[PDB]
Amino acid sequence: NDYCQHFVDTGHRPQNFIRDLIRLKDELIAKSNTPPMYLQADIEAFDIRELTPKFDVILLEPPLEEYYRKCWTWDDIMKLEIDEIAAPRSFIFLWCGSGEGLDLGRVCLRKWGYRRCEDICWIKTNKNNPGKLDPKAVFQRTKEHCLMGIKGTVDIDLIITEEPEIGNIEKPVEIFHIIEHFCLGRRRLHLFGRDSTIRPGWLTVGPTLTNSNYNAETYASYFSAPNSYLTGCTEEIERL
Amino acid sequence: LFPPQWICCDIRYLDVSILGKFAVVMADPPWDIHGTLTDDEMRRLNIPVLQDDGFLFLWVTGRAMELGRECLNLWGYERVDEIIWVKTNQLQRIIHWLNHGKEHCLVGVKGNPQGFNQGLDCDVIVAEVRSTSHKPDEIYGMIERLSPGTRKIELFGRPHNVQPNWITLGNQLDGIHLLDPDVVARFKQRYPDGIISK
Ligand SMILES: Nc1ncnc2c1ncn2[C@@H]1O[C@H](CO)[C@@H](O)[C@H]1O
């Protein structure tokens, strides 16, 4: 059966018809997680060098204009000095949307010194509203891409959820599960996060946060010896 | 014209100018990742003569996600969409850092396409995996609804890829099979002894 033909006949996206041992890893991640830390900051006016120490993974979620139908253009994003806060070996996850970002986000990654190793696709079903447009678009756009970059030396590259309600710009929380399952280290930064995305194990920085608890010295103390090189997936280091 | 046509050849050496202009180009190239083509051979393919106004569909994987973007731009296209094929078994279940559930097809535009039916299909294909390197047949229907009845050309196709309205090129096709009189004429002029070299 041709689900492409079915979508043109009925408006049900092909992804609507996709169908369908770790807990002793999820709780190790949970045990190793730092307290949630968060900082209200207007990132266009804020010197990101003040966020220390250098991060093992960075999740970057700039508010693109295409998400709505203060936005950030790819001009703005590309001029962020991400290389100044990434650890020499570290990872980036960049939400690129579905338009020119798939190209300009790759320019960003290379500009900051990463190479892309994965292209994670958020595929949006419309099971709840069958049926229902960038001027250059050739096809109806029903997915978003989050590009994974690496610098220095269980899961699949797909996230499938129902398309969110109009004006709801949240990305699927499953992206956090994928990132944390890689065991990349414990200094994790989420730029352009919100009150709603704050999460144990993460430093969240963004303009709309209503409260802050970030202290650079307190934050660094979570990673001082003997805890400087943990992956975030092993046992806590015994004290006393 | 309308029934399937193909040319067994080395795409590096065929003079594709004898083929005319096409509303849609599709390619599934043997990228040199990990019988392939080097990055320079891909760059030098004479894609620009194949179209004036229309669309290019370019399958990519691994580091060809970037190299394919380079070729697309060098050949004169702007990437304007990206199709993903979610790979399933016959029960509609999905088949280095992450397991891969999908393959990507870049969509480039060249010139000013007029009269195409943009927006009928969406950019996700859900379809069963068949033999290796065999892309889903659903793409031909998406392309036909996008641009019905127009001339199309496929590069690096295999025998199962031949389709009405398409000319298929590849080195595992069986001989030559041409029916368009414009193309038959120019092929005889350019290759009077039926041999493609250099
Ligand atoms: N220079 C080439 N010219 C034409 N077809 C090729 C060439 N190199 C590889 N192919 C073919 O492209 C297809 C890739 O799936 C295979 O049939 C493969 O043999």
Considering only CA atoms, give the Rg of chain B: 17
Experimental structure resolution, Å: 2.0
CA of B188 to the centre of ligand 1 (A): 24
- On the 0-12 / 13-18 / 19+ scale of CB atoms within 10 A, B140 is buried
What is d(CA A134, CA B107) in angstroms, rounded to the nearest whole number? 14
Sequence-distant (≥ 6) Cβ neighbours of residue B55 within 8 angstroms: A138, B23, B24, B25, B107, B108, B109, B110, B113, B116, B146, B147
CA of B156 to the centre of ligand 1 (A): 5
Mutation site for B-interface testing, chosen from A139, A160, A174 by largest number of B Cβ within 10 Å: A139
Closest CA to A64 of A45, A48, A78, A46: A78
Query: How many CA atoms are closer than 13 Å to the CA of A129, on its beta-carbon side?
Result: 7
What does the DSSP assignment read for chain A? Answer: --HHHHHHHH---GGGG-----HHHHHHHHHHPPPPEEEE--TTSS-GGGS-S-EEEEEE----GGG------HHHHHTS-GGGTEEEEEEEEEEEESSTHHHHHHHHHHHTT-EEEEEEEEEEE-TTSS----TT-SSB--EEEEEEEEE----BSEEEEEPPPTT--PPPTHHHHHHHHT---S-EEEET--GGG--TT-EEEETT-S-----HHHHHHTSSTTSSS--SSSPPPP--
Q: How many CA atoms lie within 13 A of A54 on its CB side?
A: 13
**B68 pocket-lining for ligand 1 (C-beta < 6 Å):** no
Method: X-ray
Q: Give the span between the Cα atoms of B121 and A124, in whole angstroms.
A: 15
For residues A27 and A227, what is the distance between their CA atoms, to the nearest angstrom? 18
Which of helix, strand or coil describes residue B68? Answer: helix
Instruction: Identify which of B181, B155, B189, B149 has the alpha carbon closest to the alpha carbon of residue B169.
Output: B155
How far apart CA B57 and CA B55 sit, in angstroms, is 7
Q: Tell me the Ramachandran region of residue A95: left when phi exceeds 0, alpha when psi lies from -120 to 50, beta otherwise.
A: beta
CB A118 within 8 A of CB A112: no
Q: In what order do the strands lie in the sheet with B102-110?
A: B124-128, B78-88, B102-110, B54-60, B24-27, B152-155, B166-170, B5-8, B176-177
Most informative mutation of B171, B174, B197 for ligand 1 (most atoms within 8 A of CB): B171
Residue B110: Cβ within 10 Å count: 20
Beta bridge partners of A120: A146
Distance CA A188, CA A208 (A): 19
Give contacts of B97 with chain A, Cβ < 8 Å: 117-118, 148, 182
